[PDB]
Design a protein around this motif. Sequence first.
Motif, mmCIF file in Angstrom:
data_model
loop_
_atom_site.group_PDB
_atom_site.id
_atom_site.type_symbol
_atom_site.label_atom_id
_atom_site.label_comp_id
_atom_site.label_asym_id
_atom_site.label_seq_id
_atom_site.Cartn_x
_atom_site.Cartn_y
_atom_site.Cartn_z
ATOM 1 N N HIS A 50 0.804 -1.104 -0.186
ATOM 2 C CA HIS A 50 -0.082 0.057 0.039
ATOM 3 C C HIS A 50 0.962 1.289 -0.080
ATOM 4 O O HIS A 50 2.132 1.329 0.861
ATOM 5 C CB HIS A 50 -0.768 -0.021 1.239
ATOM 6 C CG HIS A 50 -2.010 -1.004 1.105
ATOM 7 N ND1 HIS A 50 -3.076 -0.970 0.678
ATOM 8 C CD2 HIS A 50 -1.858 -2.098 2.006
ATOM 9 C CE1 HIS A 50 -3.859 -2.089 0.800
ATOM 10 N NE2 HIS A 50 -3.254 -2.973 1.659
ATOM 11 N N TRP A 182 -2.031 -0.008 -4.817
ATOM 12 C CA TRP A 182 -1.691 -1.362 -3.954
ATOM 13 C C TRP A 182 -1.003 -2.350 -4.905
ATOM 14 O O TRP A 182 -1.701 -2.762 -5.695
ATOM 15 C CB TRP A 182 -3.049 -1.776 -3.164
ATOM 16 C CG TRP A 182 -3.094 -3.438 -2.831
ATOM 17 C CD1 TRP A 182 -2.597 -3.596 -1.515
ATOM 18 C CD2 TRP A 182 -3.279 -4.596 -3.355
ATOM 19 N NE1 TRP A 182 -2.381 -5.017 -1.212
ATOM 20 C CE2 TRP A 182 -2.661 -5.458 -2.335
ATOM 21 C CE3 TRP A 182 -3.661 -4.956 -4.633
ATOM 22 C CZ2 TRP A 182 -2.998 -6.804 -2.721
ATOM 23 C CZ3 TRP A 182 -3.963 -6.266 -4.930
ATOM 24 C CH2 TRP A 182 -3.480 -7.235 -4.047
ATOM 25 N N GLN A 183 0.351 -2.502 -4.481
ATOM 26 C CA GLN A 183 0.940 -3.557 -5.202
ATOM 27 C C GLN A 183 1.239 -2.993 -6.408
ATOM 28 O O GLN A 183 1.079 -2.051 -7.260
ATOM 29 C CB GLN A 183 0.581 -4.981 -5.000
ATOM 30 C CG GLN A 183 0.516 -5.167 -3.537
ATOM 31 C CD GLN A 183 0.648 -6.844 -3.109
ATOM 32 O OE1 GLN A 183 0.283 -7.569 -4.000
ATOM 33 N NE2 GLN A 183 0.469 -7.148 -1.794
HETATM 34 N N LIG Z 1 -1.701 -6.728 1.188
#
Ligand SMILES: [N+]
Length: 198
Positions: A50, A182-183
Amino acid sequence: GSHMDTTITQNQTGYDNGYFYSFWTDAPGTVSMTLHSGGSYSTSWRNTGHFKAGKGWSTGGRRTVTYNASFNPSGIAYLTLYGWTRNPLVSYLIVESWGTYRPTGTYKGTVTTDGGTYDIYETWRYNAPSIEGTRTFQIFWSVRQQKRTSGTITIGNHFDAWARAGMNLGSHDYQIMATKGWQSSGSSTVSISEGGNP
Ligand SMILES: [N+]
Ligand SMILES: [N+]
Protein backbone atom coordinates in the motif's frame (compact mmCIF):
# COMPACT_ATOMS: atom_id res chain seq x y z
CA GLY A 1 13.43 25.46 -10.79
CA SER A 2 15.94 26.57 -8.16
CA HIS A 3 14.44 23.90 -5.90
CA MET A 4 16.87 21.12 -5.04
CA ASP A 5 14.69 18.07 -5.50
CA THR A 6 14.85 15.29 -2.94
CA THR A 7 13.49 11.75 -2.99
CA ILE A 8 11.57 10.33 0.00
CA THR A 9 11.33 6.61 0.82
CA GLN A 10 10.21 6.63 4.48
CA ASN A 11 6.85 7.62 6.03
CA GLN A 12 6.73 11.28 6.54
CA THR A 13 5.00 14.54 6.32
CA GLY A 14 6.18 18.16 6.09
CA TYR A 15 6.09 21.31 4.01
CA ASP A 16 7.79 21.96 0.67
CA ASN A 17 7.50 25.42 -0.96
CA GLY A 18 4.53 26.18 1.32
CA TYR A 19 2.79 22.95 0.26
CA PHE A 20 1.97 20.26 2.78
CA TYR A 21 3.22 16.86 1.64
CA SER A 22 2.57 13.33 2.85
CA PHE A 23 4.26 10.04 1.97
CA TRP A 24 3.07 6.76 3.48
CA THR A 25 3.74 3.11 2.70
CA ASP A 26 3.83 -0.35 4.27
CA ALA A 27 6.53 -1.50 1.82
CA PRO A 28 9.50 0.85 2.33
CA GLY A 29 12.12 0.58 -0.42
CA THR A 30 9.60 -0.26 -3.17
CA VAL A 31 8.17 3.23 -3.67
CA SER A 32 9.51 6.77 -3.69
CA MET A 33 8.23 10.31 -3.85
CA THR A 34 10.29 13.08 -5.42
CA LEU A 35 9.61 16.62 -4.22
CA HIS A 36 9.71 19.18 -7.03
CA SER A 37 9.30 22.98 -7.19
CA GLY A 38 5.99 24.51 -6.00
CA GLY A 39 3.04 22.13 -5.81
CA SER A 40 4.74 19.41 -7.89
CA TYR A 41 5.94 15.90 -7.03
CA SER A 42 6.70 12.60 -8.75
CA THR A 43 6.29 8.99 -7.63
CA SER A 44 7.79 5.71 -8.74
CA TRP A 45 6.86 2.24 -7.53
CA ARG A 46 7.85 -1.34 -8.31
CA ASN A 47 6.15 -4.39 -6.77
CA THR A 48 5.04 -2.24 -3.84
CA GLY A 49 2.54 -2.64 -0.96
CA HIS A 50 0.00 0.00 0.00
CA PHE A 51 1.22 3.53 -0.73
CA LYS A 52 -0.10 7.09 -0.83
CA ALA A 53 1.81 10.24 -1.77
CA GLY A 54 0.75 13.83 -2.44
CA LYS A 55 1.01 17.58 -2.04
CA GLY A 56 -1.63 19.99 -0.83
CA TRP A 57 -2.71 21.45 2.49
CA SER A 58 -2.39 20.37 6.12
CA THR A 59 -5.95 21.59 6.77
CA GLY A 60 -8.51 20.86 4.06
CA GLY A 61 -11.56 22.88 3.07
CA ARG A 62 -13.86 23.89 0.22
CA ARG A 63 -10.96 24.78 -2.08
CA THR A 64 -11.17 25.04 -5.82
CA VAL A 65 -7.95 23.45 -7.05
CA THR A 66 -6.28 23.05 -10.45
CA TYR A 67 -3.95 20.17 -11.32
CA ASN A 68 -1.95 18.64 -14.16
CA ALA A 69 -0.70 15.05 -14.10
CA SER A 70 1.14 12.26 -15.84
CA PHE A 71 -0.32 9.02 -14.44
CA ASN A 72 1.10 5.63 -15.41
CA PRO A 73 -0.15 2.62 -13.37
CA SER A 74 0.44 -1.04 -14.32
CA GLY A 75 -2.02 -2.26 -11.68
CA ILE A 76 -4.31 -0.88 -8.97
CA ALA A 77 -3.60 2.82 -8.48
CA TYR A 78 -5.59 6.06 -8.35
CA LEU A 79 -5.02 9.69 -9.20
CA THR A 80 -7.17 11.44 -6.61
CA LEU A 81 -7.86 14.47 -4.47
CA TYR A 82 -7.57 12.67 -1.13
CA GLY A 83 -8.28 13.88 2.40
CA TRP A 84 -9.21 13.18 6.01
CA THR A 85 -11.64 14.48 8.60
CA ARG A 86 -11.93 13.87 12.33
CA ASN A 87 -15.08 13.67 14.47
CA PRO A 88 -16.20 11.68 12.60
CA LEU A 89 -13.06 10.01 11.21
CA VAL A 90 -13.58 9.92 7.43
CA SER A 91 -11.30 9.41 4.44
CA TYR A 92 -12.54 10.89 1.16
CA LEU A 93 -11.35 10.46 -2.43
CA ILE A 94 -12.27 12.45 -5.52
CA VAL A 95 -11.00 10.01 -8.16
CA GLU A 96 -9.87 11.53 -11.47
CA SER A 97 -8.14 8.46 -12.92
CA TRP A 98 -7.53 4.81 -12.05
CA GLY A 99 -5.65 1.73 -13.26
CA THR A 100 -6.80 -1.89 -13.46
CA TYR A 101 -9.48 -1.37 -10.79
CA ARG A 102 -12.25 1.23 -10.76
CA PRO A 103 -13.50 1.97 -7.21
CA THR A 104 -17.01 0.83 -6.35
CA GLY A 105 -19.18 0.45 -3.28
CA THR A 106 -22.58 1.49 -1.97
CA TYR A 107 -23.85 3.77 -4.75
CA LYS A 108 -25.49 7.03 -3.68
CA GLY A 109 -26.02 8.84 -6.99
CA THR A 110 -24.04 11.32 -9.08
CA VAL A 111 -22.61 14.81 -8.95
CA THR A 112 -21.94 16.87 -12.08
CA THR A 113 -19.06 19.30 -11.68
CA ASP A 114 -15.98 20.53 -13.58
CA GLY A 115 -17.03 19.36 -17.06
CA GLY A 116 -17.89 15.82 -15.96
CA THR A 117 -20.10 13.55 -13.88
CA TYR A 118 -18.94 11.56 -10.83
CA ASP A 119 -20.39 8.41 -9.30
CA ILE A 120 -20.83 8.64 -5.53
CA TYR A 121 -19.94 5.69 -3.30
CA GLU A 122 -19.58 4.96 0.40
CA THR A 123 -17.41 2.12 1.71
CA TRP A 124 -16.11 1.06 5.13
CA ARG A 125 -12.58 0.29 6.27
CA TYR A 126 -12.11 -2.06 9.24
CA ASN A 127 -9.23 -1.85 11.74
CA ALA A 128 -7.03 -0.10 9.17
CA PRO A 129 -4.21 2.49 9.29
CA SER A 130 -5.49 6.05 9.70
CA ILE A 131 -4.54 9.52 10.96
CA GLU A 132 -5.88 8.30 14.34
CA GLY A 133 -4.05 4.94 14.34
CA THR A 134 -5.70 1.56 13.74
CA ARG A 135 -9.37 2.42 13.21
CA THR A 136 -12.66 1.47 11.58
CA PHE A 137 -14.03 4.34 9.47
CA GLN A 138 -16.05 5.52 6.47
CA ILE A 139 -14.66 6.20 3.01
CA PHE A 140 -16.50 8.72 0.81
CA TRP A 141 -15.92 8.41 -2.96
CA SER A 142 -16.49 10.53 -6.05
CA VAL A 143 -15.31 8.61 -9.14
CA ARG A 144 -15.30 10.45 -12.50
CA GLN A 145 -17.25 8.58 -15.21
CA GLN A 146 -14.40 9.18 -17.66
CA LYS A 147 -10.71 9.31 -16.70
CA ARG A 148 -8.79 12.56 -16.89
CA THR A 149 -5.31 13.70 -15.85
CA SER A 150 -5.76 17.48 -15.75
CA GLY A 151 -8.24 20.16 -14.82
CA THR A 152 -10.04 21.94 -12.03
CA ILE A 153 -11.67 20.27 -9.03
CA THR A 154 -14.39 22.21 -7.21
CA ILE A 155 -14.07 20.31 -3.91
CA GLY A 156 -17.06 22.20 -2.43
CA ASN A 157 -19.37 20.58 -5.02
CA HIS A 158 -18.32 17.10 -3.92
CA PHE A 159 -18.73 17.99 -0.22
CA ASP A 160 -22.26 19.28 -0.92
CA ALA A 161 -23.31 16.26 -3.00
CA TRP A 162 -22.06 13.87 -0.30
CA ALA A 163 -23.94 15.84 2.38
CA ARG A 164 -27.16 15.60 0.32
CA ALA A 165 -26.58 11.83 0.02
CA GLY A 166 -26.28 11.62 3.83
CA MET A 167 -22.49 11.30 3.80
CA ASN A 168 -21.33 13.63 6.57
CA LEU A 169 -17.78 14.96 6.96
CA GLY A 170 -16.10 15.99 10.21
CA SER A 171 -13.47 18.61 11.05
CA HIS A 172 -10.98 18.68 8.18
CA ASP A 173 -7.49 17.33 8.46
CA TYR A 174 -5.17 17.19 5.44
CA GLN A 175 -6.12 17.44 1.77
CA ILE A 176 -3.71 16.41 -0.99
CA MET A 177 -3.62 15.67 -4.72
CA ALA A 178 -2.49 12.09 -4.31
CA THR A 179 -1.09 9.15 -6.20
CA LYS A 180 -2.30 6.09 -4.28
CA GLY A 181 -2.04 2.37 -4.94
CA TRP A 182 -1.76 -1.26 -3.93
CA GLN A 183 1.09 -3.45 -5.22
CA SER A 184 2.24 -3.69 -8.88
CA SER A 185 4.27 -0.87 -10.46
CA GLY A 186 4.15 2.58 -12.04
CA SER A 187 4.95 6.27 -11.91
CA SER A 188 3.27 9.68 -11.70
CA THR A 189 4.13 13.37 -11.90
CA VAL A 190 1.51 15.67 -10.36
CA SER A 191 1.29 19.45 -10.07
CA ILE A 192 -1.36 21.09 -7.86
CA SER A 193 -2.27 24.67 -7.01
CA GLU A 194 -5.22 26.43 -5.44
CA GLY A 195 -7.08 28.36 -8.14
CA GLY A 196 -9.47 28.04 -11.05
CA ASN A 197 -13.14 29.02 -11.10
CA PRO A 198 -15.52 27.15 -8.75
N1 LIG B 1 -1.73 -6.45 1.28
N1 LIG C 1 -6.10 0.06 -1.54
